[PDB]
């Protein structure tokens, strides 16, 4: 039962800030806002989910990327609630395109993971229980969810592909398909599997991000609750 749960508070988005290549997915400009076509979202939904279903059961990987602030957290919920990687704070240049190298930083993280619970939580020169331990802070900050995948993913799920354009670029460059929740903001043509929605509303990001992680576990059996996905929602 998706359907009218979309009208729920999740249809339409921005206004006169549009990309005109997103014109097909628009129903009208009621009240000076671009109300995005409800039902075309559904036609795009199944096709997308179907690709995820297939990708999920094949034991592949999605990379979740939401760095815009309203998504920051609801992304790291659903990604963890799917055992998938996520990128949350900053998309770094070449997480994908220069993966090998950015990986070496994961490699470094767990050398320092290995010195907190260690005999050297007592020793190390004075100016190194900040020098080393502050290095682990940043590595913790950016490479929280990215620490998981250790070969390129098989797809990426992007929240705002215009906000997250550097990421999409790299995907396509590498022929990694691009799933995205996108809206009037964005150029659809370079999203492979698009979910015409609303990159802003915590409702919309939530409704979609979660139900997609249903399918992900549900292609593996044994679904859980509609998730810890309500920050202090309001």
């Amino acid at each position: 039962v998706k359907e009218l749960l979309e009208a729920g508070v999740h249809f339409g988005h921005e206004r006169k800030r549009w990309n005109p290549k997103f014109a097909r997915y628009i129903y009208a400009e009621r009240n000076g806002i671009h109300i995005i076509d409800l039902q075309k979202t559904m036609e795009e939904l199944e096709r997308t989910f179907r690709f995820i279903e297939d990708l999920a059961m094949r034991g592949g990987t999605i990379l979740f990327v939401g760095t815009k602030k309203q998504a920051q957290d609801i992304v790291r919920m659903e990604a963890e609630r799917a055992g998938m990687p996520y990128v949350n704070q900053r998309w770094l240049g070449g997480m994908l395109t220069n993966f090998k190298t950015i990986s070496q930083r994961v490699h470094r993280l767990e050398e320092l993971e290995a010195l907190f619970a260690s005999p050297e939580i007592e020793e190390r020169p004075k100016k190194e229980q900040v020098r080393l331990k502050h290095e682990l802070e940043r590595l913790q900050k950016y490479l929280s969810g990215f620490r998981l995948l250790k070969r390129l993913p098989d797809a990426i799920f992007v929240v705002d592909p215009t906000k997250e354009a550097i990421a999409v670029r790299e995907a396509r460059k590498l022929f990694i398909p691009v799933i995205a929740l996108a809206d009037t903001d964005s150029d659809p043509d370079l999203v492979d599997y698009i979910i015409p929605g609303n990159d802003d509303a915590i409702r919309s990001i939530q409704l979609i991000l979660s139900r997609a992680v249903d399918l992900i576990i549900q292609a593996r059996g044994g679904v859980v609750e509609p998730s810890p996905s309500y920050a202090l929602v309001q």
Binding site: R169, R172, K173, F175, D189, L190, D192
Partner: protein
């Protein structure tokens, strides 16, 4: 005033296709229609049809592309890679049948107006005629 309606038509097509338009209208002419027929038969366009735009005769023209493509820039391959007038008001070009050219070793057409009607190179060569060399499409 529009000096060459055929060049116009061709160019409307060239232009609409370069931004993956679904269709273009082009002011209607019988001659224009005959060129489209060929164009359609040879699978460059989907097809075409008469219409009125502000109650005046056009020819809507349904364009046609490849599939979506892979990496960066997934814009479709084009069916009309090339389309180009030859004979023009400034300089008409006429050929005998022995000097009708082979367009891109035949992977391409040349439309061609003859006294046995508008024809492609092959149609006209087998029909043993020449005439005004209108345009080449690949």
């Amino acid at each position: 005033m529009l000096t060459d309606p055929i060049a116009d038509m061709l160019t409307r097509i060239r232009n609409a296709t370069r931004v993956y338009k679904e269709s273009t209208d082009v002011p209607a002419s019988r001659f224009k229609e005959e060129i489209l027929r060929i164009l359609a038969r040879e699978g460059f366009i989907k097809g075409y049809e008469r219409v009125d735009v502000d109650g005046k005769p056009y020819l809507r023209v349904y364009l046609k592309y490849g599939p979506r493509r892979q990496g960066p820039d997934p814009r479709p391959e084009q069916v009309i890679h090339h389309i180009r007038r030859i004979s023009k008001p400034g300089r008409r070009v006429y050929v005998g049948v022995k000097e009708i050219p082979r367009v891109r070793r035949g992977l391409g057409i040349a439309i061609l107006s003859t006294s046995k009607g508008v024809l492609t190179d092959r149609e006209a060569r087998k029909l043993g005629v020449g005439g005004e060399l209108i345009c080449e499409v690949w």
